[PDB]
Amino acid sequence: PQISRQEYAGLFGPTTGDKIRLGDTNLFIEIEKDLRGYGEESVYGGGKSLRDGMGANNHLTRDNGVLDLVITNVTIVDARLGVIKADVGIRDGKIAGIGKSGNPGVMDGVTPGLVVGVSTDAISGEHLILTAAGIDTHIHLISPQQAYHALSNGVATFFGGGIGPTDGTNGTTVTPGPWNIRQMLRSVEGLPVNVGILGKGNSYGRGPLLEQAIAGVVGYKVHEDWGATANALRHSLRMADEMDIQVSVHTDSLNECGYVEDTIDAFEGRTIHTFHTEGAGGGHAPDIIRVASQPNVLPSSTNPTLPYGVNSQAELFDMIMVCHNLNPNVPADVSFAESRVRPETIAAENVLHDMGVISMFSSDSQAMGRVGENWLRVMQTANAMKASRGKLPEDAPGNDNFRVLRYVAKITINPAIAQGVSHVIGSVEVGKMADLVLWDPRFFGAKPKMVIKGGMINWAAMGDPNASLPTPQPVFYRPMFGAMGKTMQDTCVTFVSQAALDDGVKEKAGLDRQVIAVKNCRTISKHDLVRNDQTPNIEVDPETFAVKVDGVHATCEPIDTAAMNQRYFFG
Amino acid sequence: PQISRQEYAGLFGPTTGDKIRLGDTNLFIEIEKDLRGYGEESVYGGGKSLRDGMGANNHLTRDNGVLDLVITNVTIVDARLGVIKADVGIRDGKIAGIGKSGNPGVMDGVTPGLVVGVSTDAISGEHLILTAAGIDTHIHLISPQQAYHALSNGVATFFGGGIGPTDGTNGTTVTPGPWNIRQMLRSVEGLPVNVGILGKGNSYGRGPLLEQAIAGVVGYKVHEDWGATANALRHSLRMADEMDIQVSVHTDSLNECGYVEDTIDAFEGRTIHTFHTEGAGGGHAPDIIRVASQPNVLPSSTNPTLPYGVNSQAELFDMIMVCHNLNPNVPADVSFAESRVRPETIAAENVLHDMGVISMFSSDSQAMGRVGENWLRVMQTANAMKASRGKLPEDAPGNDNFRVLRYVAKITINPAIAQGVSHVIGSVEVGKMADLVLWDPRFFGAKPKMVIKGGMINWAAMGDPNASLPTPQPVFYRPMFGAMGKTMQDTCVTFVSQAALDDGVKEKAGLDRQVIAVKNCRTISKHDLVRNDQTPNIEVDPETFAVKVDGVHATCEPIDTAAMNQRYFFG
Amino acid sequence: NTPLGGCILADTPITFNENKPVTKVKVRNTGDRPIQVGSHFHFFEVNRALEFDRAAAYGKRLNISSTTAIRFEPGDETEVPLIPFGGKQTLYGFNNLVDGWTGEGVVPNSERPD
Amino acid sequence: MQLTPREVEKLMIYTLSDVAFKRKARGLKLNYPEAVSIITVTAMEGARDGKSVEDVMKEASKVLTKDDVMDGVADLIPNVQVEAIFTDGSRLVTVHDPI
Amino acid sequence: MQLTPREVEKLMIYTLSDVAFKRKARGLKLNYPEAVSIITVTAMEGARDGKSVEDVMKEASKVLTKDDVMDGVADLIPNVQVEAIFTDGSRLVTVHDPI
Amino acid sequence: MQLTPREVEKLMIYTLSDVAFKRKARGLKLNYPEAVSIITVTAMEGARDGKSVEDVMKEASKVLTKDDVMDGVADLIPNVQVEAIFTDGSRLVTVHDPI
Ligand code: NI
Ligand code: NI
Ligand code: NI
């Protein structure tokens, strides 16, 4: 038999050749492949394929393959080989398989690592989009509520440091010393996200860094407030080599110890994570972006600058006075900010994201950054760069997959590669953890329906609990069974160094959460980062702060109206 | 070099000789001493003293002295030797030292117990006030939310009893029997404050009291509803001698068993805590203040009467009918209230706080008392007594330190002395626990910025978590990392008796919270209470309820407008 | 009178650490970008671009109030007073040029060149 | 704003008073939560205006009659308690049978 | 509606703004939370109307004077911060001393 | 009041309806949460006024048109659900495409 794609899309969703508009943006994503034989589509409901002896089967769960949960045909948006329509399988809180689901005994072409049985509970995958959860490498642990706002936008993983609302924490992502580290690893027991604590990387001795590695830090942090000296970095990098961890830097914006070229000599070509590569958050003013030209560097960026707006120049001149307690009356404090508010590098930052130079995207939450606008501000920049720079030579002639796949990589797979947790989380691949997000294409990048963590829903959109359905208003997001009781700890991961794991941090610190050690932080480079392997030549004018990439001025005009904001949000 | 104090106050805060106005009150507090050599002031920020090789150091944490947290230059308000400007150090959740911070290797005059290193995370101590957290000896465990309102005003310690909203609990602070005690010690695991459970002290036998001691109580409670007989008190005190705990009394208001003369003979000069020494809450009417003239007594007071207002008379006639379920139609129920609403003792209570007779402050929460206005109502009374009675002969000629130090002692060190927890908490001294509160002098005694508990911030003022800073509105108080996961239990203390500690209540009852025993409850007297060692002669008229202290009528006219209320609060 | 939460400071200026030697030095920014040095930063272990008598800055910080930093614009030459460090005078880090001690000062000061 | 939990919960009671006054304007008999909402706001507003405990208690009793509420709402409300911030501080407001 | 926590908390701040302009109508000196409430709502409404960061900052400073608030409220407010959703996205609004 | 959680959460939805009607008065195109707020309040008010399920469903569809909302808000709202307390009890109110 034959039927039109209009009635097929209304029930089973799109397939090969169908383009999906991402909200109110000008971006359209086309399905590159459909991993299913037409005719035996698996969906749950009243009198549908998933019943006894049809989709299910009499065999046991021990028969490696019976899923704990299945997403009934969804459009995946992965950076490795995304924009595909396929049934995704969950088992033991990990991605079992990606292809076709059902009973192989009565259905042809069923994938071996993907069978529905008595243990499966289906999810309405049709008319929705699946993706890997977001990661934030710049998180100041100022407030624990921060996670609820992050998780309410598709960010189920945190990376940073802090105690609470201390001025020390308000400006620097550090949990300094074993005592503070243990108290924070233990406070994270009551959090519904993965965490990676960063220690203070400011020391001349090898010992003070070793104490933090064995305590349970995923890396180190070198701030200008705590002294970003050539020795503070050399010793933080020397220890990061022998410990297999990632160092994050917020270089000296005062150019006190040296210039940007002197800190690159102090790095000694060793892999390093650079926060706010643009310069608003910090770093050797003016030519910080110059650091993104070298291969060892892993460039990230704060999100208050992206997208480049018309009114962005005004807000950041007052914002800079609170984060790093700078006075508005002292001349050395205000004249220091005049250089850091340079608008030419903010426009360059936006085009460098399109070119594939700035390999990832962070925030710098409650300290020149917003945690609940990450996925949104990524898609907002994608709309601006398509409308100005047009389709790329690598991008397809009829779809905007290449740009979206390049931009989703900045928040999903690249930050996971940077902090040595690729094998755990990052992409929708087989054998990885089930940290996934579901959104309607109408509300893509801003408001998801569900947030699956370790195969269980942690956070989701929910109506009146007393009502006869989950959709009746008021529909506000609330914690689910994946964030309740002992299941919150099970499904969340406390990341640490191998040294700490080998020492027995889980037993010594008494962590009921899952404890996975970070690895492959040091050997990685910019070529290992997905869809952002470019290392272009750079020329920056120091007087007017103009940026030239490969002998071409990198800039763009600001936009007044951005995609998805007052149309979906209220406040 | 020389610079004016105006520019110094704008950066490093006040020093010796500078007076600070406490909000909208008429009270000014002068700095008695500055424990720092001028020139090397330690503050954190972008390009400031606390960096690598300046304030920090390459030595390890295990070198006893490296702080986990430091408060950069703050005005302390302690009752022992307060009103001083000094850097306070935190280590292992205890106060390491009070003086000058930094690196002794490159700075002169650094205190040995106080050194900044790689393990320290600084707090902006400048332009703020530090103090010990408040203690509430009269807490009805009617609702667990009560703690959030208490902690939102600088009260991080509770003492009392109850099951929940039972009429038994609504009128008496009792957790009676081992079963109820155990269930409450276990329910307190999910509370962000220190707790001291009080048992029922109403028995003729020694056994029923012994069962509660070994179950894990810090003391006993003798209520008029459960029978405040001479034998109930004698047996409660006999057991409190051999157990080293504190008994709290709410004497028989009906004068049934005897008069005030009968109860003091039944005490046998043994140390005892008297709730609502004024008489609104309870106690053999009319001459219940007469008990304050004895040295063994530890007088406390409920806070709905303090400060003495013009409209206080009206509300008490109706409030008294719900707390102790008294009917408005029965003549014996309304006619006994007519004596308990006496307005002459409420004005005397306010003057007795200034004289230094009523040694401490409590509340009697959700039963003729407010938990979220203790620090406020203390400072409200201080403003009224200065405006009426003027500066004391002991008070200095140019500052109101003596009155504030006397009044902060009533909520910080004296209730801790009464319940045998002085050595644990009470004052900002070396070796004590880090249960501290931080407030702006603008918002002193009403709204604090942070609340440090065991060296970690438990509760604090926080804005929008999604915003780029912690200050943006809506700024409402929320639980911090010190109240999340396993760190809430670590930083909070379940107080018990020695008998229980040695029996193994922590293991038997399975308490993940810290368990410290109470001690030095019996040998203490009024002279051991800080700034309130007065035992004056008393003469009370029984007909008109007039109070004469040392042959002088103790009273004061009521006030219509009190300090800090409508100007700061909303509801 | 003073507003709510204000400070009634006494009419007296603060005196910053006396009886310590002072060394005035002319510092010129040769580089095309601005440089700002904080109160406790060790001047001898600063950027090589700044042209000044480097040998005179052994274990000597700026003679200004703590916390505060003075900014240098490209080309601008500014005179700056320097003060030695306190305590044991043992500093570490910065650029691995000395990482040790500087208070030997036995009659004419010598030892440790760049 | 530094809104303490006592101030945050006093906003949801204000949200209901606007719905109670709006339904009163159309001519509707108020229910239990609506009647208590408009009774409690007059105490909070009375305390804000600087009125004494005696005035606000008697004023809270003269807001609604038995014809202004549904049949049986007066029988289940023999007392209405609420705390408002006065010029001297927080004070209890007991209204014994306002209908 | 799918109201994110950032949107839910922005409703309790608007509930207070209606009480602030209702008390302003009767002729009352606003307190700390009421003053900040009516200052922040003009930024959220300004961002909704499509006004720039420059306009809303200066407009938020010209809402109330020292005579419109209680004695001492101007001394404890040297700055007012709040985030509103503009046409280009969420932007900070710092009002340095509006009185 | 003894406000059950179902009643407490129904106040934050009413707080938004006053902002939706106030922005409608100035002449502004309503967004997703504002449009759904003023759509749901007519069902709760309709159920309070004693209107039947048939009446409130059709009345909720005739509140706003495509010109009264922003471009694309009608495309993302093919259905609006909410539960209101009627004279007979709590009943569902499904409005299939009100614009
Ligand atoms: Ni930063
Ligand atoms: Ni009592
Ligand atoms: Ni009591």
Side-chain angles (χ1 to χ4, degrees), chain B residues 505-524:
Chain B
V505 141
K506 196 174 78 179
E507 290 73 31
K508 289 179 173 212
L511 313 174
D512 294 321
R513 272 160 65 108
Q514 204 160 23
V515 183
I516 308 300
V518 308
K519 48 163 194 171
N520 197 56
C521 289
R522 290 288 114 194
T523 58
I524 57 148

PDB file of all heavy atoms in Angstrom, chain B residues 505-524:
ATOM      1  N   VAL B 505      23.837   7.255  71.411  1.00  0.00           N
ATOM      2  CA  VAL B 505      22.616   7.707  70.744  1.00  0.00           C
ATOM      3  C   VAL B 505      22.893   7.887  69.251  1.00  0.00           C
ATOM      4  O   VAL B 505      22.049   7.502  68.450  1.00  0.00           O
ATOM      5  CB  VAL B 505      22.008   8.991  71.402  1.00  0.00           C
ATOM      6  CG1 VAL B 505      21.443   9.970  70.374  1.00  0.00           C
ATOM      7  CG2 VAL B 505      20.932   8.612  72.415  1.00  0.00           C
ATOM      8  N   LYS B 506      24.066   8.431  68.878  1.00  0.00           N
ATOM      9  CA  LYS B 506      24.418   8.650  67.469  1.00  0.00           C
ATOM     10  C   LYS B 506      24.320   7.353  66.657  1.00  0.00           C
ATOM     11  O   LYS B 506      23.833   7.390  65.529  1.00  0.00           O
ATOM     12  CB  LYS B 506      25.832   9.248  67.335  1.00  0.00           C
ATOM     13  CG  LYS B 506      26.105   9.847  65.956  1.00  0.00           C
ATOM     14  CD  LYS B 506      27.442  10.563  65.873  1.00  0.00           C
ATOM     15  CE  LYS B 506      28.603   9.607  65.729  1.00  0.00           C
ATOM     16  NZ  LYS B 506      29.902  10.328  65.627  1.00  0.00           N
ATOM     17  N   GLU B 507      24.727   6.211  67.248  1.00  0.00           N
ATOM     18  CA  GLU B 507      24.696   4.903  66.580  1.00  0.00           C
ATOM     19  C   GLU B 507      23.327   4.238  66.718  1.00  0.00           C
ATOM     20  O   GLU B 507      22.796   3.729  65.733  1.00  0.00           O
ATOM     21  CB  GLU B 507      25.784   3.967  67.143  1.00  0.00           C
ATOM     22  CG  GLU B 507      27.211   4.367  66.787  1.00  0.00           C
ATOM     23  CD  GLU B 507      27.793   5.575  67.502  1.00  0.00           C
ATOM     24  OE1 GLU B 507      27.409   5.827  68.669  1.00  0.00           O
ATOM     25  OE2 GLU B 507      28.648   6.263  66.896  1.00  0.00           O
ATOM     26  N   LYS B 508      22.753   4.248  67.935  1.00  0.00           N
ATOM     27  CA  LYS B 508      21.442   3.646  68.206  1.00  0.00           C
ATOM     28  C   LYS B 508      20.336   4.346  67.408  1.00  0.00           C
ATOM     29  O   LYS B 508      19.566   3.672  66.722  1.00  0.00           O
ATOM     30  CB  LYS B 508      21.119   3.686  69.706  1.00  0.00           C
ATOM     31  CG  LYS B 508      21.955   2.718  70.527  1.00  0.00           C
ATOM     32  CD  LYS B 508      21.630   2.801  72.009  1.00  0.00           C
ATOM     33  CE  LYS B 508      22.317   1.732  72.825  1.00  0.00           C
ATOM     34  NZ  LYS B 508      21.499   1.314  73.995  1.00  0.00           N
ATOM     35  N   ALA B 509      20.284   5.690  67.468  1.00  0.00           N
ATOM     36  CA  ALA B 509      19.300   6.485  66.729  1.00  0.00           C
ATOM     37  C   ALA B 509      19.712   6.741  65.270  1.00  0.00           C
ATOM     38  O   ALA B 509      18.884   7.245  64.512  1.00  0.00           O
ATOM     39  CB  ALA B 509      19.055   7.813  67.429  1.00  0.00           C
ATOM     40  N   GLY B 510      20.957   6.428  64.895  1.00  0.00           N
ATOM     41  CA  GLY B 510      21.444   6.587  63.528  1.00  0.00           C
ATOM     42  C   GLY B 510      21.398   8.016  63.029  1.00  0.00           C
ATOM     43  O   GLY B 510      20.667   8.320  62.084  1.00  0.00           O
ATOM     44  N   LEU B 511      22.172   8.899  63.673  1.00  0.00           N
ATOM     45  CA  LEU B 511      22.198  10.329  63.367  1.00  0.00           C
ATOM     46  C   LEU B 511      23.438  10.721  62.573  1.00  0.00           C
ATOM     47  O   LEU B 511      24.540  10.754  63.123  1.00  0.00           O
ATOM     48  CB  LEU B 511      22.147  11.133  64.676  1.00  0.00           C
ATOM     49  CG  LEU B 511      21.099  10.686  65.688  1.00  0.00           C
ATOM     50  CD1 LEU B 511      21.247  11.443  66.980  1.00  0.00           C
ATOM     51  CD2 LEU B 511      19.697  10.841  65.136  1.00  0.00           C
ATOM     52  N   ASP B 512      23.255  11.062  61.285  1.00  0.00           N
ATOM     53  CA  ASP B 512      24.359  11.507  60.430  1.00  0.00           C
ATOM     54  C   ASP B 512      24.803  12.930  60.800  1.00  0.00           C
ATOM     55  O   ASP B 512      25.873  13.368  60.364  1.00  0.00           O
ATOM     56  CB  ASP B 512      23.980  11.426  58.944  1.00  0.00           C
ATOM     57  CG  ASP B 512      23.762  10.007  58.452  1.00  0.00           C
ATOM     58  OD1 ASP B 512      24.523   9.110  58.868  1.00  0.00           O
ATOM     59  OD2 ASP B 512      22.855   9.804  57.620  1.00  0.00           O
ATOM     60  N   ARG B 513      23.994  13.649  61.604  1.00  0.00           N
ATOM     61  CA  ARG B 513      24.356  14.973  62.107  1.00  0.00           C
ATOM     62  C   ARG B 513      25.446  14.856  63.167  1.00  0.00           C
ATOM     63  O   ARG B 513      25.678  13.779  63.720  1.00  0.00           O
ATOM     64  CB  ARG B 513      23.137  15.717  62.698  1.00  0.00           C
ATOM     65  CG  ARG B 513      22.356  16.518  61.672  1.00  0.00           C
ATOM     66  CD  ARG B 513      20.948  16.841  62.128  1.00  0.00           C
ATOM     67  NE  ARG B 513      20.933  17.724  63.295  1.00  0.00           N
ATOM     68  CZ  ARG B 513      20.579  19.008  63.313  1.00  0.00           C
ATOM     69  NH1 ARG B 513      20.171  19.615  62.199  1.00  0.00           N
ATOM     70  NH2 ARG B 513      20.608  19.693  64.446  1.00  0.00           N
ATOM     71  N   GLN B 514      26.096  15.979  63.456  1.00  0.00           N
ATOM     72  CA  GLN B 514      27.143  16.048  64.471  1.00  0.00           C
ATOM     73  C   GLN B 514      26.460  15.940  65.834  1.00  0.00           C
ATOM     74  O   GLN B 514      25.364  16.477  65.998  1.00  0.00           O
ATOM     75  CB  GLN B 514      27.934  17.358  64.312  1.00  0.00           C
ATOM     76  CG  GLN B 514      29.350  17.339  64.881  1.00  0.00           C
ATOM     77  CD  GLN B 514      30.229  18.430  64.294  1.00  0.00           C
ATOM     78  OE1 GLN B 514      29.755  19.455  63.789  1.00  0.00           O
ATOM     79  NE2 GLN B 514      31.541  18.245  64.366  1.00  0.00           N
ATOM     80  N   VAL B 515      27.038  15.169  66.770  1.00  0.00           N
ATOM     81  CA  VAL B 515      26.442  14.964  68.094  1.00  0.00           C
ATOM     82  C   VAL B 515      27.436  15.389  69.168  1.00  0.00           C
ATOM     83  O   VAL B 515      28.449  14.721  69.378  1.00  0.00           O
ATOM     84  CB  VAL B 515      25.976  13.501  68.294  1.00  0.00           C
ATOM     85  CG1 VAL B 515      25.288  13.323  69.653  1.00  0.00           C
ATOM     86  CG2 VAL B 515      25.050  13.068  67.159  1.00  0.00           C
ATOM     87  N   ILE B 516      27.122  16.498  69.858  1.00  0.00           N
ATOM     88  CA  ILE B 516      27.929  17.049  70.943  1.00  0.00           C
ATOM     89  C   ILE B 516      27.082  16.994  72.205  1.00  0.00           C
ATOM     90  O   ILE B 516      25.885  17.246  72.129  1.00  0.00           O
ATOM     91  CB  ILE B 516      28.377  18.498  70.608  1.00  0.00           C
ATOM     92  CG1 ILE B 516      29.051  18.598  69.212  1.00  0.00           C
ATOM     93  CG2 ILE B 516      29.293  19.050  71.706  1.00  0.00           C
ATOM     94  CD1 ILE B 516      30.333  17.739  69.015  1.00  0.00           C
ATOM     95  N   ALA B 517      27.670  16.715  73.363  1.00  0.00           N
ATOM     96  CA  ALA B 517      26.876  16.677  74.589  1.00  0.00           C
ATOM     97  C   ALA B 517      26.903  18.019  75.279  1.00  0.00           C
ATOM     98  O   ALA B 517      27.862  18.777  75.133  1.00  0.00           O
ATOM     99  CB  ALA B 517      27.382  15.601  75.534  1.00  0.00           C
ATOM    100  N   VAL B 518      25.854  18.291  76.060  1.00  0.00           N
ATOM    101  CA  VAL B 518      25.760  19.508  76.857  1.00  0.00           C
ATOM    102  C   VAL B 518      26.432  19.254  78.216  1.00  0.00           C
ATOM    103  O   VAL B 518      26.316  18.161  78.787  1.00  0.00           O
ATOM    104  CB  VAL B 518      24.306  20.034  77.007  1.00  0.00           C
ATOM    105  CG1 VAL B 518      23.636  20.169  75.648  1.00  0.00           C
ATOM    106  CG2 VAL B 518      23.459  19.177  77.947  1.00  0.00           C
ATOM    107  N   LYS B 519      27.125  20.271  78.727  1.00  0.00           N
ATOM    108  CA  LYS B 519      27.830  20.199  80.009  1.00  0.00           C
ATOM    109  C   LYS B 519      27.953  21.591  80.657  1.00  0.00           C
ATOM    110  O   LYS B 519      27.860  22.605  79.968  1.00  0.00           O
ATOM    111  CB  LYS B 519      29.221  19.558  79.833  1.00  0.00           C
ATOM    112  CG  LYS B 519      30.044  20.131  78.677  1.00  0.00           C
ATOM    113  CD  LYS B 519      31.512  19.765  78.796  1.00  0.00           C
ATOM    114  CE  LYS B 519      32.412  20.571  77.897  1.00  0.00           C
ATOM    115  NZ  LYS B 519      33.846  20.323  78.200  1.00  0.00           N
ATOM    116  N   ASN B 520      28.202  21.608  81.981  1.00  0.00           N
ATOM    117  CA  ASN B 520      28.340  22.802  82.828  1.00  0.00           C
ATOM    118  C   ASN B 520      26.999  23.598  82.872  1.00  0.00           C
ATOM    119  O   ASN B 520      26.964  24.817  82.676  1.00  0.00           O
ATOM    120  CB  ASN B 520      29.526  23.665  82.367  1.00  0.00           C
ATOM    121  CG  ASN B 520      29.985  24.671  83.401  1.00  0.00           C
ATOM    122  OD1 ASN B 520      30.314  24.309  84.536  1.00  0.00           O
ATOM    123  ND2 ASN B 520      30.037  25.958  83.038  1.00  0.00           N
ATOM    124  N   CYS B 521      25.901  22.865  83.144  1.00  0.00           N
ATOM    125  CA  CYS B 521      24.535  23.395  83.240  1.00  0.00           C
ATOM    126  C   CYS B 521      24.163  23.731  84.689  1.00  0.00           C
ATOM    127  O   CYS B 521      23.401  24.674  84.931  1.00  0.00           O
ATOM    128  CB  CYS B 521      23.536  22.392  82.663  1.00  0.00           C
ATOM    129  SG  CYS B 521      23.605  22.204  80.862  1.00  0.00           S
ATOM    130  N   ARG B 522      24.652  22.917  85.639  1.00  0.00           N
ATOM    131  CA  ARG B 522      24.300  22.992  87.056  1.00  0.00           C
ATOM    132  C   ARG B 522      25.123  23.973  87.887  1.00  0.00           C
ATOM    133  O   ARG B 522      24.545  24.701  88.693  1.00  0.00           O
ATOM    134  CB  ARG B 522      24.452  21.593  87.672  1.00  0.00           C
ATOM    135  CG  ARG B 522      23.396  20.617  87.174  1.00  0.00           C
ATOM    136  CD  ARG B 522      22.036  20.961  87.766  1.00  0.00           C
ATOM    137  NE  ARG B 522      21.062  21.417  86.778  1.00  0.00           N
ATOM    138  CZ  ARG B 522      19.912  22.012  87.080  1.00  0.00           C
ATOM    139  NH1 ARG B 522      19.588  22.251  88.348  1.00  0.00           N
ATOM    140  NH2 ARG B 522      19.079  22.388  86.118  1.00  0.00           N
ATOM    141  N   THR B 523      26.454  23.961  87.744  1.00  0.00           N
ATOM    142  CA  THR B 523      27.325  24.828  88.542  1.00  0.00           C
ATOM    143  C   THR B 523      27.180  26.315  88.191  1.00  0.00           C
ATOM    144  O   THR B 523      27.463  27.158  89.044  1.00  0.00           O
ATOM    145  CB  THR B 523      28.789  24.418  88.384  1.00  0.00           C
ATOM    146  OG1 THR B 523      29.150  24.471  87.003  1.00  0.00           O
ATOM    147  CG2 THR B 523      29.068  23.036  88.947  1.00  0.00           C
ATOM    148  N   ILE B 524      26.750  26.636  86.957  1.00  0.00           N
ATOM    149  CA  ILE B 524      26.599  28.027  86.519  1.00  0.00           C
ATOM    150  C   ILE B 524      25.510  28.766  87.320  1.00  0.00           C
ATOM    151  O   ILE B 524      24.602  28.146  87.875  1.00  0.00           O
ATOM    152  CB  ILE B 524      26.334  28.148  84.995  1.00  0.00           C
ATOM    153  CG1 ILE B 524      25.090  27.353  84.545  1.00  0.00           C
ATOM    154  CG2 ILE B 524      27.566  27.713  84.207  1.00  0.00           C
ATOM    155  CD1 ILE B 524      24.379  27.973  83.413  1.00  0.00           C
TER     156      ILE B 524
END
